[PDB]
């Protein structure tokens, strides 16, 4: 198909923004240990919102690109409107870069004045630091997007992949509305914040992720669409079974009932299952191939994505989802260790997987690059993937020691927040190295084009 080349810009700008993300990571990573680094010009909290808002934004660009690519093929017909796909891109990309520059060029309390938050207060919540106007912009785009690729599935084949992907995307945009509801009651606020973050990342995004993985496994392994789509539905079912009540693992210590401690801890124990399925799903279909596929990197990406997501989301997720454990780790470097692997392994890698598949056949190079670009992608893969297992190790170390010094002792023996942070400094430097190796591996990956 020929309208699939509107997915190309989405994929590039995603990778552009992905480089912005890692830099600001590296700054913050250093501010941990050189406390007044770039102060007062760029305070830690500004670097952090740029770091995390680039992540959330470059993953959407990455998800949209994938839909603009793979929905034509699945629907067996051209995209409803390539005009729209380009008009939205620039709006979204303008909207993104402005919002980021807002964080960077004006004091946040000022930006709240400038954009007039008083009328409709939604600013100042983790991941949702963007001005209300900017949120509105994101919804407009996300509506234009949904519509455009939504129509394409109607006027064409209705494969399971295409359907589930539409569910995930519709659901993504709906839940994002709760970013507008901003309760006066703090505990009410927190309750409904996790409808954005958790039902995204552990519910609705798992449909997006699963669907792309399954779409990729059909094309590189040549296995029967009918067993792939079966397996897909299993993984999804297991995701929404565990994950919807499993939300309760975020509802332990925020001022809601204690019955969530049982419900959250019981249902969260099940949330690594979908991820365990994902690796069996990758490994089997990739192992019973009717095909040796010319792009050897995709197979590595698909297998790695599923493993890394299992380790980050699943294993690291389980390790501290049990209220008894979570009590001592809640809001610790351990939480940061998990978040990093779970975000990277699941969603950063799956965007890179489908890019690794579609990019050559968006530049009309072929199904694969030459052997130069291929051993580079794979170098990048490993540098990044291995860089991040260290990042999570180093921070897991911090978190464990931190629980030890600050959290477990009783009043008086408990060492101070800012005092324990001084013990953790070595780990934080090691992490900056891991972070540098990561940037290298991202640059390796990037040179492969």
């Amino acid at each position: 198909f020929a309208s699939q080349a509107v997915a190309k810009p989405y994929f590039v700008f995603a990778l552009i923004l992905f480089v912005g993300q890692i830099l600001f990571g590296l700054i913050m990573g250093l501010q941990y240990v050189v406390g007044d680094f770039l102060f007062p010009a760029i305070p830690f909290n500004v670097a952090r919102m740029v770091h995390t808002n680039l992540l959330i934004v470059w993953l959407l660009f990455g998800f949209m690109g994938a839909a603009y690519y793979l929905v034509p093929e699945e629907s067996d017909c051209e995209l409803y409107s390539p005009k729209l796909a380009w008009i939205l891109f620039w709006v979204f990309a303008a909207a993104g870069v402005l919002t980021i520059l807002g964080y960077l060029l004006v004091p946040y309390a000022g930006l709240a004045r400038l954009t007039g938050n008083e009328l409709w207060p939604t600013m100042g919540r983790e991941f949702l630091e963007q001005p209300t106007i900017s949120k509105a912009g994101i919804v407009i785009v996300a509506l234009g997007f949904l519509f455009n690729v939504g129509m394409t599935v109607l006027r064409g084949r209705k494969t399971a992949i295409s359907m589930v992907l539409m569910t995930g995307l519709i659901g993504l945009a709906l839940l994002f509305l709760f970013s507008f509801y901003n309760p006066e009651n703090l505990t009410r606020d927190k309750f409904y914040w996790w409808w954005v973050v958790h039902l995204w990342v552990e519910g609705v995004w798992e449909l997006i992720m699963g669907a792309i993985l399954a779409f990729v496994l059909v094309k590189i392994t040549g296995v029967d669409r009918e067993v792939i789509e079966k397996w897909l539905y299993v993984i999804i079912a297991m995701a929404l079974i565990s994950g919807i009540i499993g939300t309760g693992h975020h509802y332990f210590w925020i001022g809601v009932p204690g019955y969530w401690l049982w419900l959250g801890s019981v249902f969260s124990a099940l949330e690594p299952l979908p991820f365990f399925a994902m690796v069996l799903f990758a490994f089997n279909t990739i192992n019973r191939r009717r095909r040796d596929y010319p792009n050897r990197a995709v197979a590595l990406w698909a297998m790695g994505t599923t493993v890394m997501a299992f380790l980050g989301a699943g294993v690291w997720g389980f390790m501290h989802t049990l209220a008894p454990v979570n009590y001592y780790t809640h809001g610790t470097q351990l939480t940061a260790a998990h978040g990093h692997m779970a975000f990277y392994g699941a969603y950063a890698m799956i965007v890179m997987t489908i890019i690794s598949y579609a990019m050559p056949r968006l530049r009309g190079i072929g199904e694969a690059m030459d052997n130069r670009s291929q051993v580079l992608e794979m170098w990048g893969f490993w540098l990044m993937t291995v860089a991040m297992v260290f990042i999570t190790l180093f921070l897991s170390a911090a978190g464990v020691l931190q629980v030890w010094l600050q959290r477990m002792p009783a009043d008086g023996a408990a060492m101070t927040f800012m005092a324990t942070q001084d013990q953790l400094a070595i780990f934080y430097w090691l992490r900056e190295g891991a972070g540098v190796v990561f940037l290298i591996g991202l640059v390796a990956y990037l040179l492969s084009f």
Partner: protein
């Protein structure tokens, strides 16, 4: 074990748990007035939330352990700095001496806040510590 069977486990079993969730929230949202102490939630506590929101304190700090891991937990900073009687006066001084500027130490910005703004902040943070947060944190330090 066909593709029709797996597709229905997803369809039915999710509609079940959405309801169960929504039913579970409905209850929970009735217990909130009592667990959060909404009586004590004055327009000060509320204006204080907005100061908190407007200067992105959560981008360095945690509040009931949710936020950023750069600076201390603040859901319980009251009991650590002067308690309920002396906390406000503390925050007053604390907010206007930033940045401490001790070299190579993690910085906090000057937020140019009015004493009325800093007071609501304190009221917001006090009301927050008195939320039934199922005995979290372990200890005084956050």
């Amino acid at each position: 074990f066909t593709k029709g069977m797996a597709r229905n486990i997803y369809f039915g079993g999710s509609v079940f748990f959405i309801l169960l969730f929504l039913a579970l929230t409905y209850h929970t949202e009735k217990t909130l007035p009592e667990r959060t102490n909404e009586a004590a939630m004055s327009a000060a506590v509320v204006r204080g939330k907005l100061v908190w929101e407007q200067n992105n304190c959560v981008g360095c700090h945690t509040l009931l352990g949710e936020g950023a891991y750069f600076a201390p937990e603040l859901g319980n900073v009251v009991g650590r700095r002067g308690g309920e009687e002396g906390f406000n006066t503390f925050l007053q001084a604390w907010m206007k001496i930033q940045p401490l500027n001790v070299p190579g130490r993690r910085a906090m910005p000057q937020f140019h806040l009015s004493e009325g703004q800093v007071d609501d902040l304190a009221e917001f943070l006090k009301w927050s510590s008195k939320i039934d947060t199922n005995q979290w944190p372990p200890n005084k330090e956050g």
